[PDB]
Write a protein that binds this ligand. Structure first.
Ligand SMILES: Cc1cc2c3c(c1C)C(C)(C)C[C@H]1C[C@@H](C)[C@]4(C(=O)NC(=O)N=C4N2C[C@H](O)[C@H](O)[C@H](O)COP(=O)(O)O)N31
Ligand SMILES: Cc1cc2c3c(c1C)C(C)(C)C[C@H]1C[C@@H](C)[C@]4(C(=O)NC(=O)N=C4N2C[C@H](O)[C@H](O)[C@H](O)COP(=O)(O)O)N31
Ligand SMILES: [K+]
Ligand SMILES: [K+]
Ligand SMILES: [K+]
Ligand SMILES: [K+]
Ligand SMILES: [Mn+2]
Ligand SMILES: [Mn+2]
Lengths: 497, 496
């Protein structure tokens, strides 16, 4: 099924009329990404480049915008829903609820198969030349060809028991090497550091492109420390992921992956990495920074293999539909397990994946007999001292009349219920996400502080209750008047609602 | 008369643009008219003209809802505002604000007096007036009365006779012959009321003109300077005089083609319960009235087939967001320029609910000052937040000249990615605070003081050596040769 096979998923998008088959030659040097970028900025159909200039022996086609938005408001999240066995009409809440569903139920462990489509073709050792493959130039000022924007890194702990799946960028650095981000507090870096501590120079690693869509979603989600994503993915799907062992190492990859790289992640060697047009909408031309080296020793791939590509940057791409939103999901769960009265969380698109809005159960809040200043500090202390809060710099607390999945409602609440400064608690001492330009290119420490909890609950919401009515059609007119207007609307000559 | 100089011409201009629905079915002024208008404003539909208002008698009145709300077509979004000002329907928000500022720098065109006009076609006087029997709208179900006055022009003159102010301030029917309405500091209607109070005048000559020339209602919502009569400013915008007729029962003058004029007095002593009212920030507080001054109405004159304009204000988007914060932003821009600050442009992002202004910085000029965001933000706030034009604005966002301040998406992108919360903000605890905002009147600190911020959304290098990034967008991250190959293939390949 589509959630368990990238190839099935591609056909599901084609069946939905959410995919353009581009059969004309497209240059992987900027042209494919430029098409993808414009799809993302216009919420168009996903582009499938079936004729990439420089492709050879089945490597490769490219799918752009694999989890970007559709333009129909009723199926806006449909391409995300097709990762997860949900209907194209699924809400953002439906998607986040499904991704959280595995945190309260036993894992469904993966099953092993002896082969699969990912073994249909191979290139090994000296025959590998990554600079001769059609890796895309994703933005004109990038420091290299970002082959890795939507694949899953596979890496296992020294005791063999924790295998982490995650997305982190990587670019081609040479004939047999990539360089890519391995940053604190991410699990790929935690495991890298476990190996470094016991003296391992080259860690077994694999990078799988075009994995089962449920697996790429979990790869982007900050599920708990020491939890192998494979079993979590199985529990989301209600059935196991079928894995096949790598040929050159003891790691396992999904048997129907499009393309797998087998090799090592170094503890000892770094190489210039970046710059890269990133999730906040910026590239800094000429600004590389050292990152770890991955060495590729074998490539295996499906016939007619497809490389997925996120041309990330300004709204709206995978970095905002998945990174911020899946962090929001985990922040919601963390707040609930801290005892805070949070029902829902989302990462508003306007915040460029740096904001999370938290919806408060105000009945429960009133029973907890607190106040905004105390509550805002407690929420920040809970969230900003945990990994799931790392990338988020502004938390907005809103009452339960605000739809946190609607950026218009969040902005209205923020602008009219949070007195600037007075109703905010600032956090100078917590880990800060250096990739945001106001952090690495700003006025204070790149890696520390710069966070805020904004209390956008009005004072009476903590005590006696909501005492206003919205000046809107829904709340300032009685049902009898609303029904009269809706029944007259089109006859009078107004646009269908 | 052209649409910018006649409300009646303006209504026909909207009809000609396909921007007006003639509602000939009966509509109740008790909530139904405002509910229709509210839904038009929430969906950017055509302006509703209620030609059959239940309880209308002897020509009073028709209602026009949503007179300056938005159109749904992106290319003509501000078209209803542009029709106020002799601009094309495709006019940008910047074209509109620039036109409103245009009279700052040219001599006023003084009004001309005419002996009569359409506004004198009908009258009701003295004890024949019963404001409670007129079809004044109930605009929101929890309002404290019928807000007859949401889009008319108060006319009031200083004791020395030299300053005649035109402004919009809400008022509701409060009795057979009385309105009650907001007369708040620091507004010019209150400054003038206080000048009369100080010399012992009990009843100040006043008029309220409904359906004034559209250029006049736009100036009525603009904070032009203390002591400057809006009439000559309006003439300078329109490129010719507004024709005024003297009131019958006092010495004030009103536009000769107004739809409806109330003549009477504003009391310096008498108060009555006023509000609550569903207001510009999207809220009404049921039961929360506060004493406000009394207006006494002694004569009504009106046009045949008179139209009462109505703003059913509240959540986005209505006249309070298209006019109040935007025209304040225009004046804040010029205030900053007179202070010698390097500001080129300003707008009130719709997302801010008329409490935000984004200021566009000339970064070349900024770099010449060799300053920093922390120092600059404090200076900008010290200028803006102690002036009347800054009163209603609680958050200024400073952005560089790669940000379109007229585009909420660009403003939010800059705010979210270039202003480090707290670190890059200067808070103002001691300045006048706009109590109408819920987080002020119904919040955790003084209702009338503080709660303001300047947010520095310029990146650090913008102050020193210059912009050192490029946007990760189609426009900026791909060469023109590639952009053109894509745009030339786009529809052929199957994209929208
Ligand atoms: C959906 C997505 C997720 C990304 C990234 C991207 C996309 C599309 C691309 C590659 C386009 C851009 C960069 C941007 C960059 C943030 C980063 C990365 O290079 N480094 C990083 O550490 N985390 C990244 N994530 C987030 C990451 O997958 C999650 O944080 C996940 O929880 C980690 O899994 P573990 O919890 O198991 O540790 N990239
Ligand atoms: C376009 C508009 C402008 C409004 C209001 C409204 C509309 C539609 C309504 C009536 C719907 C809602 C209230 C909301 C409320 C803010 C107020 C008001 O009741 N009191 C006030 O003092 N200012 C208002 N203004 C702004 C005012 O016109 C400008 O500030 C103008 O510069 C004043 O002229 P002077 O500079 O010459 O002093 N009203
Ligand atoms: K993960
Ligand atoms: K608050
Ligand atoms: K005015
Ligand atoms: K800044
Ligand atoms: Mn993990
Ligand atoms: Mn004035």
């Amino acid at each position: 099924p589509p959630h368990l096979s990238f190839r099935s998923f591609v056909n599901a998008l084609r069946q939905d009329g959410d995919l353009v088959d581009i059969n004309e030659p497209v240059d992987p040097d900027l042209e494919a990404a430029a098409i993808t970028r414009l799809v993302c900025e216009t919420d168009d159909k996903a582009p499938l480049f079936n004729n990439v200039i420089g492709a050879k022996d089945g490597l490769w086609r490219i799918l752009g915008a694999p989890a970007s938005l559709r333009s129909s408001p009723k199926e806006r999240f449909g391409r995300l829903a097709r990762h997860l066995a949900l209907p194209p009409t699924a809400s953002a809440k439906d998607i986040l609820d499904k991704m959280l569903s595995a945190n309260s139920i036993p894992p469904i462990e993966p099953v092993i198969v002896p082969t699969g489509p990912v073994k249909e073709n191979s290139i090994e050792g000296e025959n590998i030349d990554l600079e001769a493959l059609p890796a895309p130039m994703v933005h004109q000022s990038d420091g290299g060809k970002y082959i890795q924007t939507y694949g899953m890194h596979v890496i296992q702990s020294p005791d063999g028991c924790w295998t982490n799946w995650s997305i982190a960028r990587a670019m081609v650095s040479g004939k047999r090497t990539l360089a890519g981000l391995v940053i604190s507090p991410q699990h790929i870096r935690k495991i890298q550091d476990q190996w470094r501590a016991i003296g391992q120079e080259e860690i077994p690693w694999a990078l799988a492109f075009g994995v089962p869509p449920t697996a790429i979603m979990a790869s982007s989600m900050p599920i708990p420390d020491g939890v192998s994503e494979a079993g979590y993915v199985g529990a989301i799907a209600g059935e196991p992921i079928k894995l096949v062992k790598c040929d050159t190492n003891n790691l396992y990859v999904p048997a129907n992956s499009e393309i797998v790289l087998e090799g090592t992640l170094s503890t000892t060697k770094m190489a210039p990495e970046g710059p890269f047009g990133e999730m906040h909408g910026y590239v800094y031309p000429g600004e590389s920074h050292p990152a770890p080296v991955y060495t590729v020793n074998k490539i295996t791939y499906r016939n007619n293999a497809i490389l997925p590509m996120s041309a990330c940057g300004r709204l709206t791409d995978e970095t905002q539909t998945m990174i911020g939103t899946l962090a929001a999901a985990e922040i919601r769960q963390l707040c609930q397990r801290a005892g805070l009265p949070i029902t829902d969380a989302f990462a508003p698109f306007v915040g460029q994946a740096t904001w999370v809005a938290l919806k408060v159960d105000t009945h429960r809040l009133r029973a907890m007999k607190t106040n905004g200043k105390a509550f805002a500090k407690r929420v920040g202390d809970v969230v900003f001292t945990q990994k799931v809060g790392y990338m988020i710099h502004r938390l907005i607390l809103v009452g339960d009349d605000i739809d946190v999945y609607d950026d218009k409602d969040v902005m209205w609440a923020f602008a009219t219920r949070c007195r600037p400064g007075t109703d905010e608690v600032f956090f100078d001492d917590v880990p800060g996400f250096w990739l945001i330009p106001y952090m690495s290119h700003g006025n204070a420490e790149a890696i520390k502080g710069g966070k805020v909890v904004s209390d956008a609950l009005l004072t009476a919401e903590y005590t006696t209750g909501k005492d206003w009515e919205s000046a809107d059609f829904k709340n300032s007119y009685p049902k009898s008047i609303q029904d009269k207007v809706l029944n007259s609307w089109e006859r009078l000559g107004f646009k269908k609602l």
